[PDB]
């Protein structure tokens, strides 16, 4: 469903940019700003995998009757999919500044480019603004208009709450594995990542399908947040015990003092001497000390614990889908599960 | 109208905070984030003059019949007034980071406080999020609900466009008085400042009064943007040729290489040798060189030009009010004019 659909998706981006930079050229006064906007858009919304945005489109096709999927309905689904991707771009640009990252998706972070710097803060906010400009431009007259606006606003707020939680939890310069508990981990994942990465896209498609029922949404959310929790846990696992060539990235959670799932489990599975080592090697830069932590995880059979967790999680999700999918086609959720597992 | 009204306004802030931090305590998981939110709110939304927010309230009383101003209608107007103030707080926190300011309203900028730093970027975004949470919490059922959401979103986007324009225009480290033209100045003022500081508050009150007419709004906007242009021009003037004890602040536009109104006029009123001096003293730190610019302005009789501009501007605004105020009470606009002149 994503294989050949990803094609028309990236293709629609040129129009999105045209619309966002054309309905402003009527004021040549702001011309130079609009040019800057284009550059921000092209640099930051492109180059990912577009999983979230494509999920809006795939889900839309599965929830809407084919005779109702006219050229216009589809263009709107493409636009709302790009809105999710812009929310995404909004978070990353801002997050890379806050974390002092150097690279993202392999290339230099926007704020690290010469002559951008902290101006990237306004750039991030423009990306957020473009979402609602798109919604107005394409969905102003649709019955689900206000529903999508509120959905995107709520997803931003929840992500930002989650980011606050994450920031409070791993203060850069306040190494304290104490607050790295399971309840804090699941709370951070849920707000910072799961709501906008898994619920938002499906939720958007739902409203565009006229499925606005508070109960149906609560049902999808139950399934989707859980999928998002496993997504992140598997991401933490793979960061360390993964294969950089397959995944396409090199792990750094240990050199970043992250509240990883691994370190959370390692903390519940550790003797006072096991902790002493973690409390002295976690957050360092040296490859000698980092590799020292990996060994402690391994010794604690966390890679095994994860595999055990992956089986339990998969069973639970399938039970979740069997219990809350309807009236929606279970294929809506099964497509996502097949991707992340 | 602002004199005794400012009282109930600041008073309502405790409830705003309560509502924004209480309808979240049902999730003790995010408790610590919500506590952080409170601190962000109290530090950053308080301590200004509340002109913009109070304008929503004053305007609401003048546009709505007294028998329709029940306790609930008023609480909503108080809340929408605080929403404007939160938009305000949102911009300042973020702008102080981008400009590397040290202080604001006399005290240390939020991002400069110990243990905040660039995390202030997420804090700013939470402040923006709170606006729409308030609107949902108080106006969800009102006929002007979607109108206010769109108004706040449009005001953010326009402010952000303006900020981009301003950033492109005075690149910190690219002293180029060339781009400091009158058209660029008026464009920056209009987008960055005038729309959200003057149109937004009145516009909000209007919609709450059921005045949603596209023509009436276009009429108010014509008057209000012009008032905003004079507001900023007078602000630039006063920054230099003002009295720090009366105004309550010390000028720094010259030590900041700002695209001020003064420097814009000085550039149109300057011989090649007059410019040579400006191109060498503008943006410096030394009090000897700064004071050197002030002398060049004076010699060019800019203080006179301003006074001449202030009289022309006042006449034009009164003509503007006589021509576009109705169906609105001219007092709505005259209250603002009396304040800024």
From Swiss-Prot, chains A, B:
* Annotated positions binding Mg(2+) 2: 95, 99
**Activity control mechanisms:** Inactivated by interferon-induced RSAD2. This inactivation may result of disruption of lipid rafts at the plasma membrane, and thus have an antiviral effect since many enveloped viruses need lipid rafts to bud efficiently out of the cell.
Name where it's found: Cytoplasm
Pathway the protein contributes to: Isoprenoid biosynthesis; farnesyl diphosphate biosynthesis; farnesyl diphosphate from geranyl diphosphate and isopentenyl diphosphate: step 1/1; Isoprenoid biosynthesis; geranyl diphosphate biosynthesis; geranyl diphosphate from dimethylallyl diphosphate and isopentenyl diphosphate: step 1/1
What keywords were assigned to this record? Answer: Acetylation, Cholesterol biosynthesis, Cholesterol metabolism, Cytoplasm, Disease variant, Host-virus interaction, Hydroxylation, Isoprene biosynthesis, Lipid biosynthesis, Lipid metabolism, Magnesium, Metal-binding, Steroid biosynthesis, Steroid metabolism, Sterol biosynthesis, Sterol metabolism, Transferase
The prosthetic group or cofactor this protein requires is: Mg(2+)
Chain positions with N6-(2-hydroxyisobutyryl)lysine modification = 49
GO biological process, alphabetically ordered: cholesterol biosynthetic process; farnesyl diphosphate biosynthetic process; geranyl diphosphate biosynthetic process
Residue numbers binding dimethylallyl diphosphate: 104, 192-193, 232, 249, 258
GO MF: (2E,6E)-farnesyl diphosphate synthase activity; dimethylallyltranstransferase activity; metal ion binding; RNA binding
- Return the broad EC class: transferase
Q: How does it assemble?
A: Homodimer. Interacts with RSAD2. (Microbial infection) Interacts with HTLV-1 protein p13(II).
State the disease linkage annotated in the record. Answer: Porokeratosis 9, multiple types: A form of porokeratosis, a disorder of faulty keratinization characterized by one or more atrophic patches surrounded by a distinctive hyperkeratotic ridgelike border called the cornoid lamella. The keratotic lesions can progress to overt cutaneous neoplasms, typically squamous cell carcinomas. Multiple clinical variants of porokeratosis are recognized, including porokeratosis of Mibelli, linear porokeratosis, disseminated superficial actinic porokeratosis, palmoplantar porokeratosis, and punctate porokeratosis.
Q: What is this protein called?
A: Farnesyl pyrophosphate synthase
Q: Which span of the entire protein is present here? A: 75 to 415 of 419
């Amino acid at each position: 469903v994503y294989a050949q659909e990803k094609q028309d998706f990236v293709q629609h981006f040129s129009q999105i940019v045209r619309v966002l930079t054309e309905d402003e050229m009527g004021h040549p006064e702001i011309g130079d700003a609009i040019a800057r906007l284009k550059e921000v858009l092209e640099y930051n919304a492109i180059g990912g995998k577009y999983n979230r945005g494509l999920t809006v489109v795939v889900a839309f096709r599965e929830l809407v009757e084919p005779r109702k999927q006219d050229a216009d309905s589809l263009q709107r689904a493409w636009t709302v999919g790009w809105c999710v991707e812009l929310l995404q771009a909004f978070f990353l640009v801002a997050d890379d500044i806050m974390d002092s990252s150097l690279t993202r998706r392999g290339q230099i972070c926007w704020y690290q480019k010469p002559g951008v710097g902290l101006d990237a803060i306004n750039d991030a906010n423009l990306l957020e603004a473009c979402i609602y400009r798109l919604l107005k431009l394409y969905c102003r007259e649709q019955p689900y208009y206000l529903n999508l606006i509120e959905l995107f606003l709520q997803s931003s707020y929840q992500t930002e709450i989650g980011q606050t939680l994450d920031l409070l939890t791993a203060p850069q310069g306040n190494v304290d594995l104490v607050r790295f508990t399971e309840k804090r981990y699941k709370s951070i994942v849920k707000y910072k990542t799961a709501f906008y990465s898994f619920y938002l896209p499906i939720a958007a498609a739902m409203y565009m399908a006229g499925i606005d029922g508070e109960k149906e949404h609560a049902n999808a959310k139950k399934i989707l947040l859980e999928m998002g929790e496993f997504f992140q846990i598997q991401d933490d696992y793979l960061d360390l015990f993964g294969d950089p060539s397959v995944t396409g990235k090199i792990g750094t959670d240990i050199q970043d003092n992250k509240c990883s799932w691994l370190v959370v489990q390692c903390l519940q599975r550790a003797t006072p001497e096991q902790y002493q080592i973690l409390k002295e090697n976690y957050g360092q830069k040296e490859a000698e000390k980092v590799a020292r932590v990996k060994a402690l995880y391994e010794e604690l059979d966390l890679p095994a614990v994860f595999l055990q967790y992956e089986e339990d999680s998969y069973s639970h999700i399938m039970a979740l889908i069997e219990q809350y999918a309807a009236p929606l086609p279970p294929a809506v959720f099964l497509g996502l599960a097949r991707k992340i597992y």
